[PDB]
Amino acid sequence: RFASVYAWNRKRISNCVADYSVLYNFAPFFAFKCYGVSPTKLNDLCFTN
Amino acid sequence: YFKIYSKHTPIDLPQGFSALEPLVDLPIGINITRFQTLLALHRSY
Numbered sequence: 001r002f003a004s005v006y007a008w009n010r011k012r013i014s015n016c017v018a019d020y021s022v023l024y025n026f027a028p029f030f031a032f033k034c035y036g037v038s039p040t041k042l043n044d045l046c047f048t049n
Numbered sequence: 050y051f052k053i054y055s056k057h058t059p060i061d062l063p064q065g066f067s068a069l070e071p072l073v074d075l076p077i078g079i080n081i082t083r084f085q086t087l088l089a090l091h092r093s094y
Contacts, residue, residue, distance in 0.1 A: 012076055012078070014076060049050065049076040
């Protein structure tokens with residue numbers, strides 16, 4: 001279930017280990033653009049929120 | 050991003066000095082435009 005572009009669904013993620021490999025491992029994910037960060041360094045960064 | 054501060058001190062606002070301190074951890078994106086205070090009574094309404 002995904003909402004429309006307006007009234008978009010928003011979910012906060014915290015208190016859990018973040019493994020980003022499975023994210024970009026998906027084949028249909030053709031469009032994956034990062035701003036202020038590189039895709040290769042997502043698995044090594046620390047996030048506050 | 051939330052922001053909440055609290056500080057308890059003995060004494061209207063006096064001419065003393067006191068600094069508020071962070072107390073909670075509530076990361077949730079909300080366009081907060083409302084504020085409601087909650088009182089207490091014993092009339093049992």
